[PDB]
Design a protein around this nucleic acid. Sequence first.
RNA 1: ACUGAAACGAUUGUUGUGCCCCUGGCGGUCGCUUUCAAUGCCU
Length: 108
Amino acid sequence: MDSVVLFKPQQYSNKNPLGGGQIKRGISKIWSLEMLLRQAFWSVPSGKFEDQQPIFIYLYPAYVYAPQVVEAIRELVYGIASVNLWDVRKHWVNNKMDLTSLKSLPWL
RNA sequence: ACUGAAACGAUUGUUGUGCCCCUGGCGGUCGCUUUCAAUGCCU
Protein backbone atom coordinates (compact mmCIF):
# COMPACT_ATOMS: atom_id res chain seq x y z
CA MET A 1 0.00 0.00 0.00
CA ASP A 2 0.95 3.61 -0.83
CA SER A 3 0.21 4.39 2.87
CA VAL A 4 2.43 1.59 4.35
CA VAL A 5 5.58 1.00 2.29
CA LEU A 6 8.44 3.53 1.66
CA PHE A 7 8.55 3.04 -2.16
CA LYS A 8 6.38 2.26 -5.26
CA PRO A 9 3.86 -0.60 -4.48
CA GLN A 10 2.91 -1.23 -8.11
CA GLN A 11 5.88 -2.06 -10.33
CA TYR A 12 6.64 -5.31 -12.24
CA SER A 13 7.34 -8.34 -10.06
CA ASN A 14 9.13 -11.59 -10.79
CA LYS A 15 7.25 -13.06 -7.75
CA ASN A 16 3.71 -12.26 -8.99
CA PRO A 17 2.46 -14.42 -11.94
CA LEU A 18 3.59 -13.21 -15.37
CA GLY A 19 0.77 -11.69 -17.43
CA GLY A 20 -1.58 -11.73 -14.39
CA GLY A 21 -3.68 -8.82 -13.08
CA GLN A 22 -1.90 -8.94 -9.67
CA ILE A 23 0.24 -5.86 -10.36
CA LYS A 24 0.79 -4.82 -6.66
CA ARG A 25 3.65 -6.61 -4.83
CA GLY A 26 3.42 -8.39 -1.48
CA ILE A 27 4.66 -7.53 2.00
CA SER A 28 4.79 -9.74 5.09
CA LYS A 29 2.62 -8.42 7.91
CA ILE A 30 5.91 -8.16 9.93
CA TRP A 31 7.55 -5.87 7.34
CA SER A 32 4.30 -3.87 7.25
CA LEU A 33 4.76 -2.93 10.96
CA GLU A 34 8.43 -2.16 10.23
CA MET A 35 7.70 0.23 7.33
CA LEU A 36 5.13 1.97 9.60
CA LEU A 37 7.68 2.13 12.46
CA ARG A 38 10.07 3.84 9.96
CA GLN A 39 7.35 6.37 9.03
CA ALA A 40 6.70 6.91 12.77
CA PHE A 41 10.28 7.10 14.15
CA TRP A 42 12.38 8.37 11.16
CA SER A 43 9.54 10.73 10.01
CA VAL A 44 10.07 9.87 6.27
CA PRO A 45 7.35 10.05 3.53
CA SER A 46 5.04 7.08 2.74
CA GLY A 47 5.37 5.60 -0.81
CA LYS A 48 7.80 8.43 -1.79
CA PHE A 49 10.97 7.97 0.31
CA GLU A 50 12.94 6.22 -2.51
CA ASP A 51 12.87 9.49 -4.57
CA GLN A 52 15.04 11.03 -1.80
CA GLN A 53 17.67 8.48 -3.10
CA PRO A 54 18.15 7.05 0.43
CA ILE A 55 21.41 5.17 1.06
CA PHE A 56 21.68 3.48 4.44
CA ILE A 57 24.90 3.06 6.42
CA TYR A 58 24.71 0.29 9.05
CA LEU A 59 27.27 0.50 11.91
CA TYR A 60 27.71 -3.16 12.98
CA PRO A 61 29.98 -4.14 15.96
CA ALA A 62 33.37 -5.87 15.77
CA TYR A 63 31.40 -8.75 17.41
CA VAL A 64 31.04 -7.08 20.87
CA TYR A 65 30.24 -3.65 22.28
CA ALA A 66 30.42 -2.69 25.97
CA PRO A 67 27.27 -0.92 27.40
CA GLN A 68 29.06 2.48 27.28
CA VAL A 69 29.83 1.99 23.54
CA VAL A 70 26.16 1.21 22.72
CA GLU A 71 25.26 4.42 24.61
CA ALA A 72 28.02 6.20 22.60
CA ILE A 73 26.53 4.88 19.30
CA ARG A 74 23.05 6.05 20.48
CA GLU A 75 24.46 9.58 20.93
CA LEU A 76 25.84 9.33 17.36
CA VAL A 77 22.92 7.87 15.33
CA TYR A 78 20.25 10.12 16.92
CA GLY A 79 22.59 13.20 17.02
CA ILE A 80 24.89 13.13 13.93
CA ALA A 81 25.18 16.29 11.82
CA SER A 82 23.98 16.28 8.20
CA VAL A 83 27.35 16.28 6.40
CA ASN A 84 28.30 19.02 3.94
CA LEU A 85 31.45 18.15 2.02
CA TRP A 86 32.48 21.78 1.34
CA ASP A 87 33.82 22.37 4.89
CA VAL A 88 35.23 18.81 5.19
CA ARG A 89 37.27 19.87 2.11
CA LYS A 90 38.12 23.22 3.75
CA HIS A 91 39.35 21.70 7.04
CA TRP A 92 41.56 19.22 5.09
CA VAL A 93 43.26 21.44 2.45
CA ASN A 94 43.90 23.59 5.53
CA ASN A 95 45.71 21.27 8.03
CA LYS A 96 47.92 20.24 5.05
CA MET A 97 45.95 17.05 4.18
CA ASP A 98 46.70 15.38 7.55
CA LEU A 99 43.58 13.20 7.76
CA THR A 100 43.91 13.21 11.59
CA SER A 101 42.41 16.75 11.44
CA LEU A 102 39.00 15.16 10.67
CA LYS A 103 39.03 13.49 14.13
CA SER A 104 38.38 16.89 15.78
CA LEU A 105 35.65 18.49 13.61
CA PRO A 106 32.07 19.02 14.96
CA TRP A 107 30.33 15.86 13.62
CA LEU A 108 27.43 16.04 16.18
C1' A B 1 10.06 -24.62 -13.56
C1' C B 2 18.30 -22.48 -11.60
C1' U B 3 15.54 -16.96 -5.77
C1' G B 4 13.32 -19.94 -12.81
C1' A B 5 11.12 -19.13 -18.36
C1' A B 6 11.43 -13.66 -22.37
C1' A B 7 14.10 -8.74 -20.87
C1' C B 8 17.92 -1.91 -25.34
C1' G B 9 18.22 3.59 -19.52
C1' A B 10 15.71 4.42 -24.37
C1' U B 11 14.08 8.38 -27.64
C1' U B 12 15.85 13.70 -29.58
C1' G B 13 19.68 17.27 -29.62
C1' U B 14 25.50 21.55 -34.08
C1' U B 15 30.34 23.42 -28.34
C1' G B 16 27.20 27.17 -30.16
C1' U B 17 26.94 32.58 -31.23
C1' G B 18 30.67 37.50 -32.83
C1' C B 19 35.66 38.58 -33.88
C1' C B 20 40.64 42.28 -39.52
C1' C B 21 47.46 39.12 -36.95
C1' C B 22 46.01 44.19 -36.23
C1' U B 23 48.79 49.19 -35.83
C1' G B 24 53.79 52.01 -37.90
C1' G B 25 57.93 51.67 -41.33
C1' C B 26 61.73 55.48 -47.73
C1' G B 27 65.94 49.37 -49.79
C1' G B 28 68.16 53.68 -47.50
C1' U B 29 72.91 56.18 -47.78
C1' C B 30 77.73 57.89 -51.02
C1' G B 31 79.44 57.46 -56.15
C1' C B 32 82.07 62.15 -62.88
C1' U B 33 81.31 56.36 -67.82
C1' U B 34 86.19 58.09 -66.08
C1' U B 35 91.45 58.19 -67.95
C1' C B 36 94.67 59.34 -73.45
C1' A B 37 93.97 60.67 -78.46
C1' A B 38 96.27 66.11 -84.35
C1' U B 39 91.04 64.73 -89.46
C1' G B 40 96.10 63.24 -90.19
C1' C B 41 99.78 62.28 -94.21
C1' C B 42 101.18 64.96 -100.18
C1' U B 43 99.38 68.40 -103.94
